[PDB]
């Protein structure tokens, strides 16, 4: 019965735990914590909110240590990386990261549905777009996991989930941290988010493989 | 003997209704919208430490349900459109259309099926007290199987009908509410308007009923 | 350094003037109002503290002051008339006019005679930050000796600029403020219009300083 | 420099006192309790308010009991009294007692301004009509005290009074005890409400020797 | 072990004696005190509660504390000038016995209890609530109810002395230790017939009362 | 009594090293740790400081550990694309010492210190932070404030041997007893033409900032 | 579950990394630390137990701190100038290992362990208890005792900072937080030769000691 969410603190994941919650489904907040996030002590604030307005359906709270994978996969070779696509896909990385350390949690935790606050009106970004939601649920499929998207179809605007966390009692600000490497980059193309996400797949399955205790 | 819901708000009117089903050995879980701008609303907790005390076990308990969020949709987020249009600040009655939708979920979410209200004779001056808005949001209920009742209606002829009735229960003859800031910032609508708002806002209560229950997230 | 106050919402332009003014050694006293309509302001404090941890003794203090009375006699009582009158919901010009009431009495019964606000250049499209109902409200404070300065009014050219020089200072770049439930509940008023209103409105604004001074009670 | 304000914590009361302090008048409230009055515990709570938005002005509460007096006025020749007058005056006497109260604790902490808190729009009530306050006010001065109404001319409606308690950051609700006596009378005429005081003079000035050590 | 029975119980002398004769005799007593809004001083009560406990233990099976000060108006005081002006006597304390009784039948129904017992006394006879007439037609009322009202020492005190000595004998103090009225000497001798013409005139409203507790209406009389 | 100096302390051998032989010297050190935002592991820093207090006593006057995420993402991270695409090198952690030269003049005006030390080595002269060209740069920038910027420990380790054994005769740990950038190991050997064209292209944001620390204005560069 | 084994446990990165790869195997660990009476600064060893039962829970079965100076005194000290006037080379680090392997023996057959790991990485070598002619001296000496020796990270550690971020992935720090001995940097590299007549000289003292330890003599 229990899925995950891939909970920020932010209003997208936040409306899609909720909404889950609103179903009868538990949800197991997981948080991931790549080394570079600027104040995120407000995300504790969130988790309250929805403990007080779900209960027993919000299951647990994880927040893990993902810096490792972040830095194999997205800052270690940033240097090749950026000369060749001539764009800073960091936070496209980050994702990859997230991905790969899920695949263990899920198969450590019997879990099979993973979920996030992805959004139709933030596809300017790497992470949010159907070519990387695409690959992502390839990825998750290849592992027998689910990876849902409950709020992308929704979400036209931010006004839009501003609205109905407003009607659940819960704040229209987003509650998390910053990414130091916010605003550090312009917009790549499709083709170049699927290549990046190709060239780093090796290594993230190659994570995958470690933490299971399988390889290297 | 199986609780029903009053909606309190902590005023003589209310909370004779509740002291009145109590007396009659039904159980009642006292509920309370907060729509998020209510001044002074500290005093409802003395009102039910009163109430527990003259009534025990009866009080099955009270929810403080925030409604801010169904409250700005109906009835604020349109407020320059809405006024514009009918010519009448029909805010409060919004605010009692926001409430509704909040009890259909809640009731559903606690199997209760019997809803009351402390809706007096001596008040129909106001929109959500009128025969034509009773009427409707009563209909409205129905509609999830959910019965509304009034049971002070027809008695309370006056204020020092209620306020009488409750000193003899040992209880305090005061309204101890907060208050809209939206109290008398209107003047009296007609019954044909009061209803084409609730028929223009009727889809988005419904549709936030249907949000509360996790069926949909669209509009 | 005489302190000064700050009119401190939590958000990111009102915080930024706090700490340009403390980074100058001036020390602030952060103010404020909450006019009873706001939904999760809880965030605030959280906000209060990041600035006494960056700035110390320069915060002599944060005051939040309910001005749900004042702000429900401008905008509210009479909202119907004023919005069929106008044609535009300026309840939050009202309440900008609330607040430099209760500004004026507070300024006054504690020695301050400068007050800074977080108004910026890439906001101007709500009226409480047009150069219209800024020069408006700074003459009125002009007229008790109070001087009313916008300190960030210039520099900031875009959300960004203040967000970035927030990070420079190890503070959140989030807008830690509660909302009100009448944000986004209005389309466009002209600037004529805009000051009509303030005109209509100002009576009983300053009627509420003389009140709030105990030198009337009349109208 | 302190006064007096005689207070129940209604509403009228109330905005007597928090003129006063406005005007930087310290003011020593004065609450008399005559034995017969219900549900009299919101009044703490509208003393926190008090305290709370006016600090050190707020000198005292005293809360006296002035059963005897009441009793002695208005209660022990009731059967008499309303024979005569066909009026149930005992709220009239309860203000009579509570003026004989106020002399002896004036004369004793040094207080000569007492404030209340009746109001142009009750004057159906006859302890609120201007036959009343000036037979009051002129036994008061009769002890050299000054006893003024400070929103008697302002309050021409509970409206009035209400929207200034709003704008003070103070509830608008009357958070007072209710006499059992309430509503248990018809309207006398201002002659009736006169002789009736000049009647239970005596009575009241017999008290406040009493209460003086100086008689009976 | 006998069933529990109800006593009016005050903290004087009379009503303490009543108390005490029953559990003399192995029935167990619940206490019952109205508090009908205008009592003064009423805190030495506590003290008698504490001698009869000492002196009986399990026997006081109760005190129960009553605020019936909304009936007592609604009969005694809310009416006050006509009532007068009609009878040409000060009949609150009559109506303040009235009101109890109304209480006792709703305290009696939700508690199981169906004997009632008072110190009313012969030698206070000069007291409406007090007066044969008085008690003749409450007895007739609460028997409406299947309730028995009884007077355990009416007989017995032809004076004050009487239960005086009887409660020494007991080891408890002959004091009247209760609270007073305000109404306390507010009121010259009644008739027996305006005494009975008062009763007759209020009881639509007491039955009103007995109705509005059990929650069985709100429409008033 | 001397007066106390600064060093640019993150809990490594070198700054250790270069704290300890001011200390050695009678020279009171206020400890500066700079956390830029992006560093892991970092508790082992307070072992290191107790040590030092241990060995040391009241010559270690105060740490500092100062949040400089702001500067640094400005100066470092904000064009981190352009800067890249240009130089044809992540020069990140050159910019983060940028970042801390900003604030230590900052912090030097506010607390009346106007001598900075750091562990600088010799023979970690292949990071672009500790090379003579960015050693002189800074050397510069910080004298144009009045402030006094040496490298103790620069000319006497030639190995990270000659470190090592120093500091285990002040009975104190040989290891790195830091946080680690994330950064780390992130980037190539930069030529030193690049390393100074990258200071003097983030010279002006970085004396902006130090203007808008010491509130003088608000405008950007 | 699965069987315990022992990982030879320092702090340091490369016996770290052993401990949790086996750990991510489902295979409990007890860590076993030798103290040789000459180790400075070995206080942030228990930092890094911490961060490991924070990560594999109770895949951490346990962690013993052995006292073995006697045993190293014994082989490596007692004689120290005749063992360096016949070698020519300073051999006591040497010595250390088979003192630890002597008191692995007796830990393991008194707590019914009979695989034992190590962190040798293919990529350090250089030193002689890491030399392929020792640690095949060795697994021989624990295989007479029914005991297996392996090394699970010697080929897996490609480069150090192979086994830096992997450690990094599994959120434990990329330090070595380990002491350090006085003996280190104080040897001339031996020839494999002398390494195993060194190792043949004293294997009868550690044979002994295991003897000893095991209760079954008092004598040499
Ligand atoms: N650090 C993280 N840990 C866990 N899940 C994450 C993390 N970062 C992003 N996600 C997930 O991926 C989605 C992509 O969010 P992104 O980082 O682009 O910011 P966002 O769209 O503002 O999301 P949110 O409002 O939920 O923070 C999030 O909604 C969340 O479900
Ligand atoms: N915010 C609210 N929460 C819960 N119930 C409410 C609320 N507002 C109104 N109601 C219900 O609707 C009834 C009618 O309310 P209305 O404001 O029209 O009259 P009222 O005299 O103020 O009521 P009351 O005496 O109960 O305060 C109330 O008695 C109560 O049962
Ligand atoms: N309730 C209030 N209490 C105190 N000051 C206020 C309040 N509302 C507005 N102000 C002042 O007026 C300025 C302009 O407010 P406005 O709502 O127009 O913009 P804003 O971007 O929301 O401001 P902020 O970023 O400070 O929240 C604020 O920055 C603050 O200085
Ligand atoms: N028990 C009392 N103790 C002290 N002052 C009293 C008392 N009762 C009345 N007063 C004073 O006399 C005035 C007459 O008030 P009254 O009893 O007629 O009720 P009211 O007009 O509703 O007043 P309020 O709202 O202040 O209770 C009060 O405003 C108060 O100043
Ligand atoms: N408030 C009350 N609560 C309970 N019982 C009461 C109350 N008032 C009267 N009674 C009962 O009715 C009787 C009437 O007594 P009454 O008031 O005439 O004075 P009393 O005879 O002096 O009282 P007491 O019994 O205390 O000596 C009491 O003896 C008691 O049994
Ligand atoms: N975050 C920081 N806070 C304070 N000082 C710092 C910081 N980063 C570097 N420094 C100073 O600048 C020098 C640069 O050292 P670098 O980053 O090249 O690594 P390192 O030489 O291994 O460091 P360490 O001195 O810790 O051994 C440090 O020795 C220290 O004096
Ligand atoms: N005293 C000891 N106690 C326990 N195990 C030891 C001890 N000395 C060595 N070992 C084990 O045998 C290996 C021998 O390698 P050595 O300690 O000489 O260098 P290293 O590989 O750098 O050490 P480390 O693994 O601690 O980083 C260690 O890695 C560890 O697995």
Not at 54 to 63: A, E, I, N, R, Y
Request: charged share 20%; glycine share 6%.
């Amino acid at each position: 019965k229990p899925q995950l969410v891939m909970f920020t603190g932010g209003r997208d994941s936040t409306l899609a735990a909720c909404y889950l919650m609103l179903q009868g489904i538990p949800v197991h907040l997981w948080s991931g914590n790549s080394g570079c996030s600027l104040h995120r002590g407000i995300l504790s604030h969130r988790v309250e909110e929805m403990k007080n307005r779900f209960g027993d359906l919000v299951v647990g709270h994880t927040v893990a240590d993902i810096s490792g994978a972040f830095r194999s996969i997205a800052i270690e070779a940033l240097e090749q990386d950026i000369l060749k696509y001539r764009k800073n896909l960091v936070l496209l990385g980050e994702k990859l990261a997230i991905h790969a350390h899920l695949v263990d949690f899920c198969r450590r935790n019997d879990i099979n549905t993973i979920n996030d606050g992805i959004t139709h009106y933030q596809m300017e970004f790497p992470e949010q777009r159907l070519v990387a939601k695409t690959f992502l649920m390839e990825m998750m499929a290849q592992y027998d996991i689910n990876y849902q998207s409950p709020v992308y179809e929704f979400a036209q605007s931010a006004d839009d989930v501003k609205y109905r966390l407003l009607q659940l009692g819960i704040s229209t600000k987003s509650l998390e941290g910053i990414s130091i490497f916010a605003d550090s980059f312009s917009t790549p193309s499709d083709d170049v988010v699927l290549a990046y996400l190709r060239e780093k797949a090796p290594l993230a399955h190659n994570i995958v493989n470690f933490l299971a205790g399988e390889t290297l």
